[PDB]
Design a binder for this molecule. Structure first.
Ligand SMILES: [Mg+2]
Ligand SMILES: [Mg+2]
Ligand SMILES: [Mg+2]
Ligand SMILES: [Mg+2]
Ligand SMILES: [Mg+2]
Ligand SMILES: [Mg+2]
Ligand SMILES: [Mg+2]
Ligand SMILES: [Mg+2]
Ligand SMILES: [Mg+2]
Ligand SMILES: [Mg+2]
Ligand SMILES: [Mg+2]
Ligand SMILES: [Mg+2]
Ligand SMILES: [Mg+2]
Ligand SMILES: [Mg+2]
Ligand SMILES: [Mg+2]
Ligand SMILES: [Mg+2]
Ligand SMILES: [Mg+2]
Ligand SMILES: [Mg+2]
Ligand SMILES: [Mg+2]
Ligand SMILES: [Mg+2]
Ligand SMILES: [Mg+2]
Ligand SMILES: [Mg+2]
Ligand SMILES: [Mg+2]
Ligand SMILES: [Mg+2]
Ligand SMILES: [Mg+2]
Ligand SMILES: [Mg+2]
Ligand SMILES: [Mg+2]
Ligand SMILES: [Mg+2]
Ligand SMILES: [Mg+2]
Ligand SMILES: [Mg+2]
Ligand SMILES: [Mg+2]
Ligand SMILES: [Mg+2]
Ligand SMILES: [Mg+2]
Ligand SMILES: [Mg+2]
Ligand SMILES: [Mg+2]
Ligand SMILES: [Mg+2]
Ligand SMILES: [Mg+2]
Ligand SMILES: [Mg+2]
Ligand SMILES: [Mg+2]
Ligand SMILES: [Mg+2]
Ligand SMILES: [Mg+2]
Lengths: 132, 311, 208, 81, 116
RNA sequence: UGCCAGCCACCGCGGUCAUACGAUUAACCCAAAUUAAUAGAUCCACGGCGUAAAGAGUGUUUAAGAAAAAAAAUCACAAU
RNA sequence: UUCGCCAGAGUACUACUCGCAACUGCCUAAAACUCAAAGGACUUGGCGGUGCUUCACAUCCACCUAGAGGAGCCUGUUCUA
RNA sequence: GAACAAUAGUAAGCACAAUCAUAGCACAUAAAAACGUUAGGUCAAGGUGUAGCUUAUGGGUUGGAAAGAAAUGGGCUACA
């Protein structure tokens, strides 16, 4: 029985995000990729760096934006700039949201020594794909 | 849920305009065919399952049909069969049986099939049981069993469908070369890592050339030359035709077989329309579906397994 | 099995196709055949329309092939047919006119004969009863019998030669001796027959 | 109920159930049937087609007359107002 | 006629002493017993024996008797086709009665009543 | 502390995370008494007897009782 | 309407008594002690060297092929060190 | 808690099935395969609840290990 990245069947009441409801064998069939970069294509270099980098930005966004994160965080790399999209729940009063926008962009840009672009799409409640 | 359909169809049209104006087409002749190209170019998802790819479509194809309101605002139900829990089914049944009865008082292989179970389920907007379906179709046989009136025939036509069947080996028109003014036919066989192309000239010396060398030299294995001989010995043309050949990939038997297929394909221009069905039943023109099977991990040979131990 | 059950076998004989016009039920039948839009198998590479193809020789050819060598088995067979041929020519020219009328010079007729003559009529199957295995007399279906003959010839001329002796030669000897019924192969067939005769009582046990 | 039975010759569920739900019940008992849960029985032959037809058309008519009379008294109600 | 059941069974009323002690209650069941598959005997045994005798007298030269042998194979083909035919024969039933499926539907249509 | 030391009227608790042991901490309830022990009062059946404990291997009579009217007809035949 | 019988389970168709053509017998028939049960019927499972039907499609049997167990070596356990 | 000439079952969900992949079909293979079961495997991938260690059950440097009486599992190469 494969336990990989899966969400078990409950008494049937458990709310589930579209992503967490689609099991590993489904990648590239229904589900998409959470990140995008050149590094894994045939002739390409430095895949590892974009992986460490990605991981750290998962943890970073989960920690800078407490309790307000909706679904897993969507990274794109385009021509040396990062485009970080987030689905974010509405909890915070908007001031704090922009505080953290500036905070994040600046901090990251100076950490990875490349320009970062941030996008928050705000959602009233976690989207429910199944059950509920 | 009907308010949703009104709203959705409105926004669908507004978004339709919005699509045309950006995509730069006349909003009038814009089709679904164009809708597809449009989204496909705007939101290019490589994804294997095609339902999970982006869609903008008329809500009717998007959403399932609904069962309408089944009772007035007094609580009182419209249809008299409502309490059967399937009105949709038993209405068809009442009507069908009525048709039958009237037929009995009055009376004193085109590729046509009955609906599937799923199609009657779509027609009545009603879940069905196998038994139920079977019952009904049985009844339609009873209907066909008697003298068929006009409205009787229309009635059973509702539940009629029609299916295509196509069998012919597709016949290439020949090709007359400009150089000698002579006719040739160029076949392509493919077997098992090996493709071959064979040009067959209609007036031969019996000459058969392979990759620029003679066929005896290129197939020192007798078996192969026999395989080659098959189509020509079949059609009794053995000396009559002159073939040029180019084959690549795989090992010798695979090659000889590819040439078999390609040749037998290029030989159906110069043969009679009747001998074609023979070459089919000889199995000459049908590819070999047989290929190597991938090893599986934790096994040996795709089938062969590591020796299993009871203790 | 990359063929679904939808794909029926090819019928490869040419005489069938060229001359239909005198046969009604067969006209009906092959009409049904292609008209059915019947998906039909790509004909095998071993089966050819060659006028020279004897299916029995093919089977026996295969059963001699170790590993994947068609080439080698083909060659050994070819050399066996050849060897018998020349050996029978040698018997012919060294003989008297009467025996010249007698002698078979066709290696093929010699082969079908030497196999017809080596095939057992009955064979044994073990039956478990009350703890013991009894070997009981079973009538056999033809193809199993053919197989038993061929298997026996091959196993016999494989096993018991002295290593300086090539296969095609010994095989030829066994073929020509089995022709005259004096060969060890037939000793084997006979030990089958005898074992069946000794156990004949037990032919009650078998229920099918 | 124009028959009180199921084709397996037990009492039809609907009897137990109507009776269970506080619905009144009017049905034709036959010599084999059990009347006791039925609100208003009519003892009588369920099997012969003249009988079924008769009972049918009668309940039919009672219905029709009730409906007509309803309509009428509604019209009179409308004139009185 | 059906054997009298009066006074047979041990009951409170009965002044007599018991006759039948049923293992299972005497009631017609709804369903019917499923068909009993028949077993086989040894097939062909005769020709087998005759052909044995032949080889015994003839010192086991198969060429000496063609007759016993060909009749033996005649029997083998009659046997095999008898098995194929008894496999497709399932329309047999009782040959004048109905297969136990039919009986069982039919019996569910006019069931037997213990209760009420 | 670790099936050890121990506890319980019944069911039970202790084998490494014990609200049952021993000791704390809070509570509970009685209270010039409180628990433990042992005797009582109380406690079966005007209920049962196919499978649960219980219809005796069988008949007749004594003793003792209970009582409207009908209550000896025949072997479908194998008591002794 | 009567009579006969039953007050947890063992202990116990037993020990002692009484009577009998029995003298390893029959009948009548306890207590110490031990336990918190002992019993009847049922319910789903599981199981069955029960019975019946239907299968096994590399699969039990019959059958086909190629190997393991023997030899050298590689390499992993288990033991001795 | 079923019988379809139907006798108390209805039910969205997750499984199977369906579709995807193996570059067109088809079959085949791949994948998938719930709920539970075996207190099955792994505190040495990592992370943790409970416990222990803290001038050491911590952290470093230098060497040293992996010998065969056998017994056996799987392979490789043979016996021509
Ligand atoms: Mg698995
Ligand atoms: Mg292999
Ligand atoms: Mg009596
Ligand atoms: Mg008695
Ligand atoms: Mg019993
Ligand atoms: Mg101890
Ligand atoms: Mg503790
Ligand atoms: Mg306590
Ligand atoms: Mg305490
Ligand atoms: Mg006091
Ligand atoms: Mg009392
Ligand atoms: Mg009772
Ligand atoms: Mg008792
Ligand atoms: Mg007692
Ligand atoms: Mg008694
Ligand atoms: Mg007495
Ligand atoms: Mg007694
Ligand atoms: Mg008196
Ligand atoms: Mg009285
Ligand atoms: Mg007692
Ligand atoms: Mg006794
Ligand atoms: Mg005694
Ligand atoms: Mg006494
Ligand atoms: Mg096997
Ligand atoms: Mg198995
Ligand atoms: Mg070996
Ligand atoms: Mg070995
Ligand atoms: Mg170790
Ligand atoms: Mg050691
Ligand atoms: Mg596809
Ligand atoms: Mg498939
Ligand atoms: Mg798998
Ligand atoms: Mg699936
Ligand atoms: Mg364990
Ligand atoms: Mg284990
Ligand atoms: Mg750890
Ligand atoms: Mg910890
Ligand atoms: Mg250290
Ligand atoms: Mg070191
Ligand atoms: Mg060994
Ligand atoms: Mg090997």
């Amino acid at each position: 029985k494969n336990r990989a990245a899966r969400v078990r069947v409950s008494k049937g009441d458990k709310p589930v995000t579209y992503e967490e409801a689609h099991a590993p064998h489904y990648i590239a069939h229904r589900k998409g990729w959470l990140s995008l970069h050149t590094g894994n294509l045939d002739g390409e270099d430095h895949a590892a760096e974009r992986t460490v980098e990605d991981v750290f930005l998962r943890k970073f966004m989960l920690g800078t934006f407490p309790g307000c994160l909706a679904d897993q965080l969507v990274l794109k790399r385009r021509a040396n700039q990062l485009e970080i999209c987030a689905l974010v729940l509405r909890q915070l009063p908007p001031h704090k949201f922009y505080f953290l926008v500036g905070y994040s962009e600046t901090l990251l840009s100076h950490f990875y020594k490349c320009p970062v672009h941030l996008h928050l799409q705000t959602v009233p409640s976690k989207v429910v794909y199944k059950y509920i | 849920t009907v308010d949703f359909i009104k709203k959705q169809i409105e926004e669908f049209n507004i978004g339709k305009r919005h699509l045309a104006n950006m995509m730069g087409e006349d909003p009038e002749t814009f089709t679904q065919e164009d809708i597809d190209r449009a989204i496909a170019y705007l939101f290019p998802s490589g994804l294997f399952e095609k339902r999970a790819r982006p869609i903008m479509k008329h809500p009717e194809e998007i959403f399932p049909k609904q069962r309408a309101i089944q009772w007035g605002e007094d609580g009182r139900p419209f249809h008299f069969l409502f309490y059967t829990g399937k009105q949709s089914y038993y209405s068809l049944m009442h009507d069908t049986y009525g048709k039958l009865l009237d037929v009995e008082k009055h009376h004193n292989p085109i590729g046509s099939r009955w609906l599937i179970k799923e199609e009657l389920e779509e027609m009545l907007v009603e879940k069905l049981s196998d038994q139920d379906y079977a019952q009904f179709i049985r009844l339609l046989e009873r209907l066909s069993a008697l003298p068929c009136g006009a409205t009787e025939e229309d009635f059973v036509n509702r539940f009629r469908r029609s299916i295509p069947x196509x069998x012919x080996x597709x016949x290439x028109x020949x090709x007359x070369x400009x150089x000698x003014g002579m006719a040739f036919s160029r076949g392509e066989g493919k077997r098992k890592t090996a493709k071959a192309e064979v040009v067959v000239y209609g007036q031969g010396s019996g000459r058969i050339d392979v990759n620029g060398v003679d066929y005896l030299l290129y197939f020192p294995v007798t078996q192969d030359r026999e395989q080659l001989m098959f189509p020509l010995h079949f059609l009794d043309r053995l000396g009559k035709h002159d073939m040029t050949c180019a084959v690549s990939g795989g090992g010798r038997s695979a090659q000889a077989g590819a040439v078999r297929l390609a040749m037998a394909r290029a030989l159906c221009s110069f043969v009679t329309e009747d001998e074609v069905e023979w070459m089919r039943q000889a199995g000459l023109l049908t590819a070999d579906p047989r290929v190597r099977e991938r090893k599986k991990p934790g096994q040996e040979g795709a089938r062969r397994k590591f020796t299993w131990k009871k203790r | 099995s990359r063929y679904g059950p939808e794909y029926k076998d090819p019928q490869i004989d040419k005489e069938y196709y060229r001359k239909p016009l005198a046969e009604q039920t067969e006209e009906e039948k092959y009409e049904r055949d292609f008209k059915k839009t019947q998906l039909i198998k790509a004909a095998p590479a071993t089966k050819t329309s060659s006028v020279f193809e004897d299916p029995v020789i093919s089977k026996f050819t295969n059963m001699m092939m170790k590993g994947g060598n068609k080439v080698l088995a083909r060659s050994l067979m070819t050399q066996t047919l050849e060897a018998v041929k020349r050996k029978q020519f040698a018997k012919y020219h060294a003989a008297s006119a009467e025996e010249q009328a007698t002698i078979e010079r066709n290696p093929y007729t010699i082969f079908h004969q030497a196999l017809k003559n080596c095939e057992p009529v009955i064979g044994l199957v073990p039956i478990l009863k009350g703890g013991h295995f009894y070997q009981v007399p079973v009538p056999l279906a033809d193809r199993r019998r053919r197989f038993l003959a061929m298997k026996w010839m091959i196993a016999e001329c494989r096993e018991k030669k002295h290593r300086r002796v090539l296969m095609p030669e010994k095989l030829s000897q066994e073929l020509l001796e089995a022709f005259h019924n004096q060969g060890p192969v037939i000793k084997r067939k006979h030990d089958m027959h005898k074992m069946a005769e000794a156990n004949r009582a037990l032919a009650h046990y078998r229920w099918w | 109920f124009l028959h009180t039975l199921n084709n397996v010759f037990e009492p039809h569920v609907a009897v137990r159930d109507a009776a269970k739900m506080n619905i009144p019940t009017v049905g034709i008992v036959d010599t084999n049937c059990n009347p006791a849960l039925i609100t208003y029985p009519v003892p009588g032959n369920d099997d012969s087609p003249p009988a079924v037809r008769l009972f049918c058309r009668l309940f039919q008519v009672a219905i029709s007359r009730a409906k007509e009379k309803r309509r009428q008294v509604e019209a009179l109600y409308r004139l009185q107002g | 006629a059906t054997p009298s059941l009066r006074g047979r069974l041990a009951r409170l009323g009965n002044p007599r002493r018991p006759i039948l002690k049923p293992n299972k209650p005497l009631i017609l069941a709804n369903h019917v017993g499923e068909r009993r598959r028949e077993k086989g005997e040894a097939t062909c045994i005769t020709e087998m024996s005759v052909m044995m005798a032949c080889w015994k007298q003839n010192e086991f030269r198969d060429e000496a008797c063609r007759k016993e042998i060909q009749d033996f194979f005649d029997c083998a083909s009659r046997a095999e086709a008898a098995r194929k035919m008894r496999s497709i024969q399932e329309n047999l039933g009782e040959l004048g009665s109905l297969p136990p499926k039919k009986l069982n539907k039919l019996l569910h249509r006019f069931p037997n009543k213990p209760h009420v």
